Design a protein around this ligand. Structure first.
Ligand SMILES: [Mg+2]
Ligand SMILES: [Mg+2]
Ligand SMILES: [Mg+2]
Ligand SMILES: [Mg+2]
Ligand SMILES: [Mg+2]
Ligand SMILES: [Mg+2]
Ligand SMILES: [Mg+2]
Ligand SMILES: [Mg+2]
Ligand SMILES: [Mg+2]
Ligand SMILES: [Mg+2]
Lengths: 271, 188, 76, 115, 57, 135
RNA sequence: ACCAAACCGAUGCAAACUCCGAAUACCCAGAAGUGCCGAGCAUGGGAGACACACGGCGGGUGCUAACGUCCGUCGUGAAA
RNA sequence: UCCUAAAGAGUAACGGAGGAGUACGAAGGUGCGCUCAGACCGGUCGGAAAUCGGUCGCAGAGUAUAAAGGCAAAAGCGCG
RNA sequence: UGCUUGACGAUCAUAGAGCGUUGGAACCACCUGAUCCCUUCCCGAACUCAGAAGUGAAACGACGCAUCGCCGAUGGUAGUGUGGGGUCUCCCCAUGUGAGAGUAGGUCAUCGUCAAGCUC
């Protein structure tokens, strides 16, 4: 006997060790083992199948069924569900979605690595595309001369935003080697999912998007790039190369454990 | 040592060049520890007197941007090479407790009567000047006194010879080097 | 003593930049000593000539150690 | 050390050629006491099946023998076939393919799994 | 809204690019006023040919 | 006169002399210096003529630094030779000077003795040179 | 009492030197309008040309001389 | 082969600098194993240096052949 | 919902170099003699084999400590597309773009899958 070195309580340590060993034993497969076309057996829940007194796989409580997987999608930070070709799902869903933890075995593996199933695009996805963002500067024209350069409001907002003959807005283009950004969070979210340089890198990693955006705000380069064009919003006019350099420099330091994020989500929804 | 400034809410090359010929101003920045950098305009005449002052470089200078007052130290001077005149300053804020590296001139106060001068051939060459410094702003070394009245002919003065008084360190001595300061040799 | 005798300009360079669509056996880069290394779906033939093997879009990404340039083609 | 980075230097040739070929890799890690074995997908960073001696059903104090490695190579094939994994490549991980590594490889073939 | 441009310079000594930008805007000769939709790519040619045009609003 | 002991190549292009002198415009060793406020180039004999003028007006001590070193060889075809039969041989070496460049430095002398010595030095050069102090 | 590798510090210069590095120029994809009503491509009939000159911006040679000579890129004349 | 050649190709001069009109039956193919140059200390006739041991190295060596571009999956070295 | 450790990876100096205390619970080499395979341009250290009679430091393993290296702002400057000028081998103006170097300072990195140990 040696005293375990842990900050957790004794009973909590027992529970953690027991759950870890049970997860390793009862659930020996993950998202890795399911390329497209892979035939796998899945142990469904008590619904639609009978409880069995005689069980063959480790910790099998229900009957299994053999089927083929099209891919895998993520229903959580560390939780993944496999998409099958059978359409029932005990509902009107076009394809079933079952947690990969329910898998008990695989008979044949499809070619290639595990395939991320491409769910059908929703109108929300089309409306919230990367290119749907505002493209060029939109400045107000309250005084006489027509604006030709993009400038901050510079306290014109503070003393006069209610009295005006009309709030004429003129669209002014920017230099081709710059980005115009209205929402930093949305721009950095659509980026790292659709940009080519950052497209397929983060399938395995989870990034702290909010912390990354706050750090990007704290970076004095983007601070210099800030331009105030409206009263209650801040837009950025930053060179493409500078933005990409800053993003590449800051990004790898803002990764977090998927398991910890999943546990935080579980404790949040449970409470 | 006192100086008033402005905001300079206009950046770039043409905007920076128009200030020098039209208004005779000089841009600048105020970057520090706990605050963001702030661009600043200044008058060439006002900077000229401070530059003409001897110990103005190694001294805390109050800066009046608007009504805002701040203790500002100068540790940079961009200067036009061809004609010769001050360009944008790039001076630094002074926090009450910070290491605050800067540059300090030398004087070589006592060289009228020296051993190598009066006894042997008399020549004194000041190899280095504007020695760096690293000390808190609570005590400002305006200058460092060097005495060469006892150094004989053929001897040289290292950085370790002269002393940095009252809690002042030398970055060059923190490095693995000890530079010569002055020499006494024979005239050709 | 006398020095003329120039060479005939082998027509090197890089074709099919990183926003293109490539066929099975297109020539990507005419190179001279591996300025760019073999990415995912390129071959690096006899004279270090990068050529595609599958269809996709050229990438031009820097990967791995030594700061080497890799020319990969992405099926997108 | 001197040995560790030398064997890593030796292994990386085949370990990178298999990555280019996009083949499921059967890695191995020999020790002075007991041998491991892993099956890794065609991305270099994802393990599909793995049989080792330190499980709670094979540690008996006799590990570190050619006979012990035969059992590991036998019991890795059943877990590989449980994942439906065939058409794999054998990465010796810089170890000279003469002894216990060869026995593990032969037991992998005897276990139904084929390269 | 729209913006009217007026050609106030000749096209007979200019580059092959600005001479194409003016034609793309749709101007045929000097003192010729046309209405163009003030799109981000229509006013981009006005920037290239700013010295040939009188943007009178 | 001053020239490299050995050179990687024998002849060089004509080139151009654009821009100011941002490096070399600060006095480093001496206390007084003679910087050039006009663009041009020195031919490696003007440097010697100015050096011998500065080193004979003091005649007591001080120290002299030659900041500019000629390293650009220039060609010159001989007379009665038609153009286009190769490239001429190297006759002399040239230093390229652009505004702000410091040419000479002096220390250990009076603030006015050096001023009237650099007056002698400037008369031997084709450039309009000003007098600057250490800072 | 000369000289002197090596190392440290300060300080300058290279078309055939780079720890770096633009602006422009180039390619590919998506769009509104314009194109004198077509701008592109391919197959055929007919050709003419293959001594070029000067101006601006970048270079080689020349003496960063020549309305000098050879190039890259635009304009004019040639042919207004 | 480099520059001139102006950060896609190309681009002239009786413009600046260099080489080729071959070699290998292993100097090719495969499997398995190993580091280079250079500095210092010690070690008998060698001595700044030959062959040997150790450390510091972190490719500043080497490429069959001129220069340019690459070579720790070494494209360099040895054995069947 | 912890700590330790092995394997393969994401990314390649903000991930590196250098400076202590340490790990017995599996590995990590070391070791008995090299008998049985295998090995030495000669060597049981490289390589291999029967483990653990021994060993926890040299060795490595992570785990402390910001001198060096690396990263690097803002601002200005150099340069430059378009148009017009001057004292036109060079520079200026309007507009757009805009380096390199230097300049407060962070860091003993941040993550993915499998496997094992500590409590039971
Ligand atoms: Mg090898
Ligand atoms: Mg015409
Ligand atoms: Mg160059
Ligand atoms: Mg002809
Ligand atoms: Mg002809
Ligand atoms: Mg002519
Ligand atoms: Mg004719
Ligand atoms: Mg070219
Ligand atoms: Mg070009
Ligand atoms: Mg060879």
């Amino acid at each position: 006997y040696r005293e375990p070195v842990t900050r957790l309580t004794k009973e909590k340590l027992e529970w953690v060790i027991s759950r870890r060993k049970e997860r390793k034993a009862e659930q020996p497969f993950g998202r890795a083992h399911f390329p497209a076309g892979t035939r796998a057996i899945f142990e469904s829940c008590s619904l639609r199948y009978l409880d069995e007194n005689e069980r063959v796989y480790p910790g099998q409580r229900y009957e299994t069924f053999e089927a083929t997987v099209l891919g895998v999608v993520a229903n959580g930070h560390n939780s993944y569900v496999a998409i099958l070709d059978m359409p029932c799902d005990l509902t009107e869903s076009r394809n079933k979605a079952i947690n990969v933890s329910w898998c008990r075995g695989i008979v044949s593996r499809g070619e290639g690595n595990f395939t991320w199933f491409k769910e059908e695009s929703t109108e929300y996805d089309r409306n919230h595309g990367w290119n749907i963002r505002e493209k060029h500067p939109t400045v107000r024209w309250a005084e006489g001369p027509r604006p030709t350069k993009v400038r901050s409001l510079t306290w014109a907002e503070e003393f006069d935003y209610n009295r005006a003959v009309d709030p004429v807005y003129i669209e002014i283009n920017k230099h081709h080697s710059q980005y115009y950004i209205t929402d930093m969070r949305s721009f950095v979210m659509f980026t790292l999912r659709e940009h080519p340089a950052y497209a397929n890198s983060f399938k395995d990693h989870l990034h702290k998007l909010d912390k990354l955006v706050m750090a990007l705000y704290s970076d004095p380069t983007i601070k210099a790039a800030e331009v105030k064009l409206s009263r209650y919003s801040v837009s950025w006019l930053i060179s493409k190369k500078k933005f990409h350099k800053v993003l590449q420099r800051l990004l790898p330091f803002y990764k977090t454990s998927r398991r910890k994020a999943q546990e935080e989500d579980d404790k949040a929804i449970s409470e | 040592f006192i100086l008033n400034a402005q905001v300079r809410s206009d950046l770039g090359k043409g905007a920076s060049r128009r200030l020098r010929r039209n208004a005779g101003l000089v841009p600048a920045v105020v970057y520090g520890g706990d605050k963001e950098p702030q661009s600043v305009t200044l008058e060439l005449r006002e900077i000229a007197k401070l530059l003409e002052n001897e110990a103005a470089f190694s001294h805390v200078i109050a800066l009046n941007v608007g009504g805002a007052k701040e203790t500002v130290l100068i540790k940079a001077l961009q200067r036009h090479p061809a004609k010769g005149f001050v360009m944008h300053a790039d001076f630094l804020r002074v926090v009450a407790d910070h290491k605050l590296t800067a540059h300090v001139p030398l004087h070589f106060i006592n060289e009228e009567v020296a051993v190598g001068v009066k006894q042997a051939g008399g020549e004194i060459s000041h190899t280095i000047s504007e020695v760096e410094v690293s000390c808190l702003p609570k005590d400002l070394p305006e200058f460092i006194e060097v005495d060469m009245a006892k150094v004989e002919l053929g001897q040289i003065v290292h950085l370790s010879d002269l002393k940095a008084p009252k809690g002042v360190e030398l970055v060059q001595l923190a490095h693995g080097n000890d530079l010569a300061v002055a020499n006494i040799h024979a005239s050709r | 003593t006398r020095n003329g005798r120039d060479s005939e300009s082998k027509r090197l360079g890089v074709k099919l930049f990183g926003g293109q669509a490539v066929k099975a056996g297109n020539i990507l880069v005419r190179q001279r000593g591996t300025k760019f290394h073999a990415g995912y779906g390129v071959g690096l033939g006899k004279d270090h000539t990068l050529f595609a093997k599958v269809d996709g879009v050229v990438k031009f990404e820097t990967k791995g150690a030594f700061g080497r340039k890799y020319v990969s083609i992405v099926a997108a | 050390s001197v040995k560790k980075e030398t064997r890593l230097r030796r292994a990386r040739k085949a370990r990178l050629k298999m990555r280019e070929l996009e083949t499921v890799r059967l890695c191995v890690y020999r020790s002075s006491q007991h041998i491991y074995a892993q099956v890794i997908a065609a991305d270099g960073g994802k393990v599909l099946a793995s049989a080792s001696t330190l499980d709670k059903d094979l540690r008996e104090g006799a590990t570190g023998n050619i006979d012990a490695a035969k059992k590991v190579g036998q019991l890795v094939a059943e877990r590989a076939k449980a994942a439906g994994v065939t058409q794999v490549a054998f990465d010796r991980s810089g170890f000279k393919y003469h002894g216990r590594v060869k026995a593990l490889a032969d037991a992998a073939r005897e276990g139904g799994l084929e390269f | 809204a729209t913006v009217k441009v007026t050609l106030v310079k000749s096209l007979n000594g200019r580059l092959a690019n600005h001479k194409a930008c003016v034609k793309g805007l749709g101007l045929r000769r000097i003192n010729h006023t046309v209405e163009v939709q003030d799109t981000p790519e229509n006013r981009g040619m006005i920037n290239k040919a700013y010295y040939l045009l009188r943007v009178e609003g | 006169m001053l020239q490299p002991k050995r050179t990687k190549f024998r002849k060089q292009m004509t080139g151009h002399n654009r821009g100011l002198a941002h490096r070399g415009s600060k006095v480093s060793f001496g206390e007084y210096a003679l910087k050039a406020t006009s663009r041009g180039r020195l031919t490696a004999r003007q440097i010697e003529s100015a050096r011998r003028a500065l080193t004979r007006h003091v005649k007591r001590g001080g120290k002299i630094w030659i900041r500019v070193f000629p390293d650009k060889p220039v060609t010159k075809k001989p007379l009665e030779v038609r153009m286009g039969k190769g490239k001429g041989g190297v006759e002399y070496w040239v230093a390229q000077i652009q505004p702000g460049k410091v040419l000479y430095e002096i220390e250990g002398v009076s603030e006015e003795l050096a001023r009237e010595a650099f007056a002698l030095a400037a008369a031997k050069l084709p450039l309009a040179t000003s007098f600057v102090k250490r800072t």
